[model samples]
Target: WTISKEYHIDEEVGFALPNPQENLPDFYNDWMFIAKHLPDLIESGQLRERVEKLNMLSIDHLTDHKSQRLARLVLGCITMAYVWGKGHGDVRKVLPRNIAVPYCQLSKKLELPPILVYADCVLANWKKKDPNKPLTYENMDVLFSFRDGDCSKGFFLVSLLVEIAAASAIKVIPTVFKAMQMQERDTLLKALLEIASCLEKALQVFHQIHDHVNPKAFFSVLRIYLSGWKGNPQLSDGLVYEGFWEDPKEFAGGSAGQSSVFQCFDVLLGIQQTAGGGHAAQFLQDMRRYMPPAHRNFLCSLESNPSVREFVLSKGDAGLREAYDACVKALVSLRSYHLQIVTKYILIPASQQGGTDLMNFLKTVRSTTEKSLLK
Candidate 1:
């Protein structure tokens, strides 16, 4: 029942790093330069020109895991900017060779998709403002952005904070399993309450996103860069990776669903996505590919082990059952809050025209989570 270190789950930051490698070797300065000026380059119509002029640098210089992740973060931002910098009408069908080749190389090395995923954008894409302070939302900031402003910053950093808040819950996951194995009712109840309390804190931090990100700007200006080629009508056939492949490759956009924290909760609590009539279940399974391979493996390991819900139902202890129900209710509240944010950021602003499927899927997600409560 021991959690593996390969999962990269930190006691302090959960799935995110306490301090991600912020700089790569000088050999990859071309990427660093593009990442630093991405917002300006996109705003001034210089993104494509600058990216096209760069020499295709070798990824061999990226020697460590940290360095490799930084490379992915920089290249993911650059790739998104190149494709969607000019909006939907001017979407590029092909990624340039210089950026495409190296990006694909780094992506393969990390076992992640070549597109900008949640791992690239949120988990590995942050730095502290002050070295002396803790990793609070105020002290943290994004390394790169599609638009230099609060909207993009809030969108990424708030997600990072939520991951941090989940660290306590993650640390107790193994403990809960041990309690179940021993049939220790009191220990299991205490563990479930701790998880419920931590999720409450995470939800409080998630609400701050509204204070910083303006809904209109997020939907109209910044949302496109986070999009990918899969299931999108804008690039229905997907984008051709110039030097890497003759055929177009497709990947879903970066999403909160890709985060490991909630998925870990679902596995531990035995919350199945069966209520959505399989669409929610299938889509969630697909998102695991976008996760870091090690993280995805960690989830798989959890699934292979015993589930918390079955144990609670077996014992039939009222206190243990109540505590388990509390945890499920806390998760439902979090998903319900997410639906509220989606309404403000996507549904209302788009006049409910676009993202209807996404909206429906999310509603299904919340309802499915709510249904996980024990009777």
Candidate 2:
């Protein structure tokens, strides 16, 4: 009944070796890409099996791997739980009988705590009108990014869990490389970091969409919403091969580039923007009074209100490429009206009083068309 019985890790990650060079399969993309084919290549049984495997792996490994596995399941549970985690309940139980196993499988492999992430949930008795708008990833359930959950404790819990997963992934390198006396530590570190670097591009696709709630969307997009940026080597090269990572030894010495995760936040925190609203900042700030610290800190750092000017610059090609993918996915699920909402609500609102007339000019076209057709 579990996921482990059916799916294998190698099959799950689906990576080709980078150069004629590498050895180990890439698990980073495996983790997120699996979401790309979640309902397809992977069955609920396989996910459940992996979850259980993560549980035992956690118990057995107890090192960085424990946290990595725990972090993954926590995200899965919280994502599904967002819908089911109402009334202070652990909602994993409410998942469809089939998806339930995969969800649990993921959580189990990561060894999520029974107390914090148990399965039973009671669906709330609220009538959600049919979406009068575009169907976002949240509504469609095509990708992990499409998860529909209120941005509550589950969000915070998910954040903590991701932090754990990322940190654990970081820690795993030393342990593995150290185990192999022949493996040069530097090579191994670079490969893993490169893998992380490449996967970050893919993960952002999921991050931006799952982040549709205004605050979360602002938060997600804010991270990359900066002006004029740099190189995007890892993603452009498509480092998605298992052989490149087939050898764990390649990832030695971290990454050759000294980019900090903080660097990713650089545009948000460092870029100066002209302020427009009173306490006005990124769209995420609209929910500022409500978001938790991790969410708040990250968002506040990226606020662009300070230098909010009409002239905006774009990020590097890599960032733009990732964003374009999310945007296309949105077009698939979203309607013209929802996209129009972005033009009217988010983009227009973000612009100042001066910009209103410009926005209204376009709106008039849509409004007039509606009226003429009705007549």
Candidate 3:
């Protein structure tokens, strides 16, 4: 609660939440936790008072440990208000005025949407920009090295995650399309391999960042906040939402790593979902509704385009088969790296909680990505 004040050196008082609508945040793991519970939190009518407390903080104090926590709290509140709607599990087609207005203010104050790298290219000044200007590559802005070690570790790590996630898609889309057009098997294979590489490298940053915040605090407040929607029994076995106003079972693992990155490959490779046919596929496709308009549209366009699987099935080119097989192997390698990260950063710390075996869970997800791509 005290993380509302100013701090020394280059540090600001709190944490920043990027435009959760468009680009996923580095703090999404944490944000997802809040989003899952946010409906109930708001329904209790206790939100207004909570906001008031955050509003009262001026400096977020240099010595106090409350700054990042307070910042994440406020960011989550506005995010739920903006995206999730007026509670009860129904997606509010439009944001309520009360939530929309403050969300804008808080977003700007936090330098959210991480301007110069995302939508509107709008800075903290809040001026609206032309909608037609194509989005820019903006991950350089969120890099931890940009902070030069002056900010809190937690804050820096969150920002680092945000930037990396934003940068993930920029590489694959263009290359995949180019390969498809040329029917170049090598190029397509290389592009798919890079997708796996990008994910591996981004997640590897966690290793260098563990010292930023106290391990205990990181696990309790920060780590828990960052947990996936599903794959964690402690977090409802990853089915955080079920039997509400919407579907009976939904895996919200809130994992941008898997959902955004791996899934992108699945679609590009023409991987189809085996578990849920019509309805399941429908729900999976619509999951982008949670993403920002720009990103969601980008993916939709890709969906409508020619996929690797489609081409493979039609042409039956031996070269294409080799390339697709290589890419699938790369994904398996990437999953291996991911599991190592999960064990090191997430599992060991929360061992007592007895959550889902994310290693095995991820293996299944990665296999799905591959199987869906092939058949």
Candidate 4:
């Protein structure tokens, strides 16, 4: 009947059904967690200030594309992630700090801003000035730093991690967004606008993310799994065992690369031989690292730590409606900027086409409009 004994944090404050349309104080506590940590990102103000800024950006003659793009990308990735796997499974609450700082560090190490790195294969661009050549496929691998040996496996691994991190951002960060404000403003209006942007961005990235199954589904052994630092050692496996088969001998030994990692995730997901590369292996490593200890003789101890798993499973659900609302606050703070990217860069450019391909493009536009973005 009482959840107080369940969690040590804040003694399990009263919980009611999360109101999707209302801003909640408890919602901001999550944000505090985010701001206190790395990969902490938020707009300059609370919802109201952000809303006004969005409106102002719509009319302002001076527009900063770089700033706007960075904003949209942040908004897009986090919001999209919330949509895909938020409430499904142990999503790992992968902090953007985990991905972002490392990613940015990786980029700067190469003199690159991680955001500007565009991807997508070179398709025919008849509308372009250079019709003779299609747009070149770009640095798609930037998304693959978590790269496992296999390409597709790597994509799924990074994407799943990215979504978790994004959700962590959504859960935590709005208070910080508001605290930065020094004036009174319309928080509600801004939240409404951001909710719209988040919904839009989420639909675009959902299928792409879901297609990449987590490699954690395959693994079975504790040795190849993540173990805590000495003395605090774990002897169990990672989270969950809806059903687990025997792990192969190689995986039990804590070997590296595609083989060991594949065994790990495949075990988690109840699949087999699916692990592929750096991301997959890294994901297994990270999951094990965060789990209790691999020293436990029984792997189920790892399976028993449901608290972290609960956070993972809460992504993209009404259970997480408050988190989404917080995201609404964030999106409103940068609405106008994103509207520009969606219309100018994402939409307008995507519009110039003919035939079934063009129709498909238009379908994407309509889908985005119908689902999110103020129609």
Candidate 5:
């Protein structure tokens, strides 16, 4: 029932690092430089060449959590650029030892998959544009980018804002639990309404993606950097992390699905992914491996506790039932809105390039959320 600080869940920022380290120690200058100029390097077709020439650096100096997270952020971006920097036409199978070794080592220490994930790309990758300003979307910006200008910045910042919007809801989770345990109907209703209100705000922030990010740029320029070796046709055998493993490793791409905010909501609201024999369920369950261990533990803790839905069903009270349904409705709206964005960014663009079962998976997931509503 305790919200552990070790989990790095902030009352104000939710799963985001309250103050993400912007710079690593002087020893990691080469890695830091590459991460900073990634877009430029990728654009000029020099990322792979420069990365290949670098000396293998030790990650022993990154002992602190913040420092380790920054290292993951830098290496994750570099790894993606290294593999897919050449516009997918020349996808590289092997990640050179210099980058691969340190990245894999840090990945193990963080208990995250070796690939860039939501923790690296969105949670730990942002900085305040002005030190004095609030962490609003306008004041926030990305520390690393795969493409120039607003496309990449907007993609990350909008997601960051969505996480921020869920902060209040995350803070109220334990209160909802306590109220349920105590059988305090009024208190439970208040907490449920607060959670529902916060989710509504999150959907509003999510809608800003269209205003900030161009769909074409998001689909063509930035999407590939967020891709992983697993389930991808280009590297179906997976990617080799040289000097670390003899065989290739397959991990899913960085995705919003990996975000603890939504996962926490799913567990707290007791929403089950039942469509397609739970294909949507299994995929999301698999994504938990990509989350930071502590955050993953936080979700586990919620699942271990009694869910809000169970309590509402037990009470059979009209107001309590309606309050619980409102929270579920908020999630349905959020997932449904996400589908609309995917249509513009992924579905339409993929239609131009090619296609996948992704649209169906997303639709199934949203429909599953809708089904969680209490009748």
Candidate 6:
């Protein structure tokens, strides 16, 4: 059955309001507090010893449904630190094998990557305002409620780091629309120049933080949770909300490309999506199942809406075309950049030189992206 039939939005609270910091619930505070300290705290020398206690705490918290939800967020971030720490990228990276192993184990248990879940499953709710406000950047809050009262605290921080690609796509909205409304051709061109900037930001964040994942261990275990859509030979089976298994099997992986934002951007921009033939359309359709019910509905709501490309088509000027084409080119460039990194890290031979994993664990990435599907 379709998810819409199974879930319904409540009129009483709508998307739930955010609480003042001082009055925030305990679970909210706990997640935010840890998120604040996590970067520095992650390098602790005694992390191995601490992991045991953390696991026990997680077990204890699971008995209480509300507590378990918060606890899982906390534990997921803590475990993620090991995969994204400084010494982690070191070749002796495998030295912390014990920590890496469990992080992957816990990740499957928790159903990570964490940020992807929040974006796809948590941020798509419909907000019910008493005054009935129109959609604006501020109303984006409707898309961000966590629980009725608890709300998201530090959760967005984790999500932002992982969702750089999606973030890049979303940024296009404000950039394009602000100028379109202003009706200043020069301003539109200026904004379009920054279309590619998100890719640059994504690259920097990935290099700075993602390097922590031990390449060997990442390919071996963590890679299982990093996949995108279904039907790709390289990716997981693409079902949502499956629990953990001792052995990694085909299941729903994290959203790397299948974010609703991409589809929104495509519709809003009216860009032709002829990149991967019918595969891209199928992949985009498959992504809706993984989204939160309300958000999925919200996306469907926008299907018939007018997009920015209509503006460009109306103007039909060379300057406008230059700027608009630049935005599309920037997208192509980002995909090209990702392919280069994948080849260097995943496709090339490892022992001879620096290469991402290929044979032992990450058979999917090699099988899929290598076949020119991701581009």
Judged by whole-model lDDT over C-alpha atoms, candidate 4 comes out at 0.26
Deviating ranges (above 4 Å) for candidate 6:
1-159, 162-187, 209-211, 225-251, 260-263, 272-277, 293-302, 349-375
Tens-place lDDT per residue, model 3, 86-109, is 322333223333333434343344
| Candidate number with the higher TM-score (3 or 4) | 3
Question: Which stretches in model 5 have alpha-carbon errors above 4 Å?
Answer: 1-4, 274-277, 353-356
* lDDT by residue for model 2 (1-375), tens: 112122211111111000111111243333344333333322232443433233111122223532333334333433332222221222232223233334444445543321121111100001112346332233322112222233332233222222222332233323323423444434433434443443343333334433433543332322111100112221222112121223111111111011112111222222221123422123212323222223234334434233111111132334323332332232222223434544543464364322354345334323322322101
RMSD (CA, Å), each prediction: 1.7, 21.4, 13.6, 23.9, 1.7, 12.4
Write model 1 residue lDDT over 1-375, tens digit each, in one string.
345476778888888865899899999988899898887898799999999899989999999889999999999999998998767579887999998999999888889889999888899889998989998888988888887652788888998898889887999888898888887778989999999999988889888888889988898878888888998898998999989998999878887778888888988899885223488888888888999998899889889889788988887688888899988888889888988898899889888445788888888877877877876
Residue ranges of candidate 1 with Cα displaced over 4 Å = 1-4, 274-277
lDDT of 2: 0.28
Candidate with better TM-score, 3 vs 5? 5
Q: Which residue window of length 10 is worst by lDDT in model 6?
A: 13-22
lDDT string for model 5 (156-209, tens) is 889889998998898888888888788888999999999999998888898788
**What lDDT does each candidate get?**
0.86, 0.28, 0.42, 0.26, 0.86, 0.41
Q: What TM-score would each prediction reach against the true structure? A: 0.96, 0.21, 0.49, 0.22, 0.96, 0.46
TM-score of 1: 0.96
Q: Count the backbone clashes (under 3 Å) in each candidate.
A: 0, 52, 23, 49, 0, 2
Tell me the lDDT of candidate 3: 0.42
Q: Per-residue lDDT for 140-220 in model 6, tens only? A: 332222222222322232233434344544434445665677787787776666654653454454443233333444343
